[PDB]
Structure 1
């Protein structure tokens, strides 16, 4: 499974496949993908 975040209440869902697209506890179908857990290198120039 992959970690997802709800639109409004911003709760951690982490639903798997074949579970459609819908938040638990609220009916907001907008689910975030969350940012990667690895580091990203940048340059100040």
Structure 2
């Protein structure tokens, strides 16, 4: 559903509302949302 990233081992995975907030690989409890699908534009000024 929503892409996340493990703050320790960088494994990517998804979570729905119900699951606990941890990394499946190492059990790290600090995680970060992945970059959005949309394209970003900047004017280079």
**Structure 1 gaps, min length 5:** none
Q: How many matched pairs?
A: 45
Question: 2:17 maps to what in 1?
Answer: 17
Query: What TM-score do the two structures reach when normalised by structure 2?
Result: 0.82
In structure 2, runs of 5+ residues without a counterpart are: none
- Select the structure that is richer in strand: 2
Give 1:3-42 correspondences, 5 Å limit. 3-42=3-42
TM-score (norm 1): 0.82
What's the C-alpha RMSD, in Å, of the aligned pairs? 1.0
